[PDB]
Design an enzyme around this catalytic site. Structure first.
Site, PDB file in Angstrom:
ATOM      1  N   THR A 157      47.754  22.159  11.747  1.00  0.00           N
ATOM      2  CA  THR A 157      46.629  22.566  12.612  1.00  0.00           C
ATOM      3  C   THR A 157      45.368  21.802  12.226  1.00  0.00           C
ATOM      4  O   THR A 157      45.135  21.621  11.024  1.00  0.00           O
ATOM      5  CB  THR A 157      46.379  24.077  12.528  1.00  0.00           C
ATOM      6  OG1 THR A 157      47.700  24.604  12.555  1.00  0.00           O
ATOM      7  CG2 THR A 157      45.541  24.628  13.659  1.00  0.00           C
ATOM      8  N   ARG A 185      59.448  26.742  20.222  1.00  0.00           N
ATOM      9  CA  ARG A 185      58.578  27.779  19.615  1.00  0.00           C
ATOM     10  C   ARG A 185      57.103  27.486  19.923  1.00  0.00           C
ATOM     11  O   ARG A 185      56.604  26.349  19.612  1.00  0.00           O
ATOM     12  CB  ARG A 185      58.823  27.890  18.110  1.00  0.00           C
ATOM     13  CG  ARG A 185      57.954  28.905  17.393  1.00  0.00           C
ATOM     14  CD  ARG A 185      56.640  28.310  16.868  1.00  0.00           C
ATOM     15  NE  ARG A 185      56.018  29.051  15.756  1.00  0.00           N
ATOM     16  CZ  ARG A 185      54.918  28.598  15.130  1.00  0.00           C
ATOM     17  NH1 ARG A 185      54.367  27.459  15.503  1.00  0.00           N
ATOM     18  NH2 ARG A 185      54.358  29.318  14.168  1.00  0.00           N
ATOM     19  N   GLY A 187      53.329  28.704  18.860  1.00  0.00           N
ATOM     20  CA  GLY A 187      52.490  29.414  17.884  1.00  0.00           C
ATOM     21  C   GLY A 187      51.151  29.823  18.472  1.00  0.00           C
ATOM     22  O   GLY A 187      51.030  29.980  19.720  1.00  0.00           O
ATOM     23  N   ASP A 188      50.160  30.030  17.603  1.00  0.00           N
ATOM     24  CA  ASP A 188      48.858  30.636  17.949  1.00  0.00           C
ATOM     25  C   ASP A 188      47.886  29.620  18.547  1.00  0.00           C
ATOM     26  O   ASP A 188      47.035  30.053  19.354  1.00  0.00           O
ATOM     27  CB  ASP A 188      48.187  31.262  16.744  1.00  0.00           C
ATOM     28  CG  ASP A 188      47.749  30.227  15.724  1.00  0.00           C
ATOM     29  OD1 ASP A 188      48.632  29.664  15.096  1.00  0.00           O
ATOM     30  OD2 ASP A 188      46.568  29.908  15.708  1.00  0.00           O
ATOM     31  N   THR A 207      43.602  28.865  11.873  1.00  0.00           N
ATOM     32  CA  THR A 207      44.690  28.018  11.315  1.00  0.00           C
ATOM     33  C   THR A 207      45.487  28.815  10.304  1.00  0.00           C
ATOM     34  O   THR A 207      44.886  29.518   9.495  1.00  0.00           O
ATOM     35  CB  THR A 207      44.183  26.712  10.690  1.00  0.00           C
ATOM     36  OG1 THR A 207      45.248  26.179   9.886  1.00  0.00           O
ATOM     37  CG2 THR A 207      42.941  26.918   9.854  1.00  0.00           C
ATOM     38  N   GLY A 210      51.276  30.958  12.232  1.00  0.00           N
ATOM     39  CA  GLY A 210      51.110  31.131  13.686  1.00  0.00           C
ATOM     40  C   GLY A 210      51.404  32.562  14.124  1.00  0.00           C
ATOM     41  O   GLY A 210      50.598  33.125  14.930  1.00  0.00           O
TER      42      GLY A 210
HETATM   43 CL   LIG Z   1      51.709  27.402  13.962  1.00  0.00          CL
END
Ligand SMILES: [Cl-]
Ligand SMILES: [Cl-]
Ligand SMILES: [Cl-]
Ligand SMILES: [Cl-]
Ligand SMILES: [Cl-]
Ligand code: NA
Ligand code: NA
Ligand code: NA
Ligand code: NA
Lengths: 288, 290
Positions: A157, A185, A187-188, A207, A210
């Site tokens: 990140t 997948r 993540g955030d 960061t 996730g």
């Molecule tokens: Cl992530």
């Protein structure tokens, strides 16, 4: 006045990180800070500032976004990013990018050129071609360091927030995600209110792990504490990182409409930098 | 106060002149799916199983924009997405980009249970579905004549959910959709995003519906929970503030239950296909305001 913060990711950055690996990451942080400060002093709006800084952090191969993205389980790169304008609350996000050189720029174009916020995987790659953005072969993005990291994981990140002198805020986050992640997948980072958020009061880029950041709606939670409890930026960011999310999972950067800066993390380290019009600047990895 | 359940088949500009033959099957579907959830809660099925069972059935009803009856992308295809959240653990699961999976909500649950991840999308989600052995059918199964016509009308002119709580205060939310008619291929809306379309914690469970992009930008499900947690607002106060103060008119409706068995179903749209029931012996099916 204006303020800028940026990160090259939070996690277990060992104190014994050899100088050969420390130096390039420190140089990259300080150079990206200079790019973002030059941009704000040249009167670039905060949305252009965070895009420009995150494009650089993507291009740096030592950071997990753009080139130097971590590898999926299948040894491939799937890149994702989001951008938010605090003054309009306009936002843009992309997932599943395999050839796009600057994911954060594609997120910006979804925001500006479509009626949507979020495109992913084949439809995001097709939009990239329709727009004529820069693409390279997927092998461009894969580094030797990341081939080794995936081998060791199977065995076992970046972000920018900025405010101008007029209280206009923006946030930009970009990632390769998590080493050995299942193909597809998310993540955030691309989720508005998880990895990225900006409103009238703050801009946040998160960061770390996730799945915890998604469950914790971290970026939205900072803004919510300021709005719904009248917490200062420092109080809201501190509470989220040190009170409401588990140890060793999260760091974030945040700026306020008033030009304050916060960069709390509950991990061992966070590659970070910031500068204010008030003459504060810092470049750091570990606690001081 | 005991168990409570609320469900929706989407909010938007459902015209007050909607002819009987579109209104009818949708009102009956709401009553049928409410029965599924009431019988589950009377049997003391955990809320996470309750909301999955109801949304599976709502997916299967072709008059609802989820599963079979999903609206069409710009390319005349179906791309389905869903999310699920357990309020007690804040365990969650999400899926986007499904083309052959019969019940999107059930694959969201399998992500949560069978992987280290919350959210899988497009080819990787379809491949997880095949590893898991869930029911798949040809993409043509999901496409209806009504949605062929809806897409034709959209080019010319140019959501379902369940929340449940038991008498022990365990809370769950589930939301499933086809998305927006004439959406670009790869477009992700609010439904699969934890804190936008779906959220559950110790205090509330929330499912949102209406214009995806407004719901992402307004982080609607999380905002209801944040007003309760950070301002001490009631479920009703928080739900009403989000729908009638913090979001544009004509964009949003939501269903919500509290740990205490309260129900709220506010909307800023013309209508919202909705139903609820409580152990105290209240039940309601509705489309327009009273
Ligand atoms: Cl992530
Ligand atoms: Cl119909
Ligand atoms: Cl069944
Ligand atoms: Cl949608
Ligand atoms: Cl009502
Ligand atoms: Na990089
Ligand atoms: Na847009
Ligand atoms: Na359906
Ligand atoms: Na999981």
């Amino acid at each position: 006045g204006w303020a800028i913060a940026l990160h090259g990711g939070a996690g277990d950055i060992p104190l014994s990180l050899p100088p050969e690996r420390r130096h390039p990451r420190e140089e990259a942080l300080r150079h990206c800070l200079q790019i973002g400060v030059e941009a704000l002093k040249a009167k670039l709006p905060p949305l252009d500032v965070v895009e420009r800084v995150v494009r650089e952090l993507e291009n740096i191969p030592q950071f997990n976004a753009g080139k130097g993205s971590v590898l999926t389980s299948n040894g491939t790169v799937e890149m994702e990013a989001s951008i938010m304008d605090g003054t309009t609350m306009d936002c843009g996000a992309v997932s599943g990018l395999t050839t796009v050189v600057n994911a954060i720029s594609l997120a910006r174009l979804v925001m500006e050129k479509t009626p949507h916020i979020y495109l992913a995987f084949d439809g995001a790659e097709e939009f990239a071609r329709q727009q004529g953005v820069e693409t390279l072969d997927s092998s461009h993005f894969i580094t030797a360091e990341n081939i080794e990291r995936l081998k060791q994981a199977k065995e076992a990140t970046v972000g920018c927030v900025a405010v101008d002198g007029n209280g206009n805020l923006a946030s930009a986050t970009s990632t390769g995600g998590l080493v050995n992640k299942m193909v597809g997948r998310i993540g955030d980072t691309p989720l508005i209110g998880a990895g990225t958020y900006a409103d009238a009061r703050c801009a946040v880029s998160a960061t770390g792990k996730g799945e915890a950041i998604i469950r914790g709606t971290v970026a939205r939670d900072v803004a919510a504490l300021m709005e719904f409890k009248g917490l200062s930026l420092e109080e809201a960011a501190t509470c989220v990182v040190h009170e409401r999310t588990p140890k060793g999972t999260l760091g974030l950067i945040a700026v306020s409409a008033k030009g304050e800066v916060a960069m709390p993390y509950n991990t061992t380290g966070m590659f970070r930098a910031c500068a204010t019009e008030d003459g504060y600047s810092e470049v750091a990895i570990w606690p001081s």
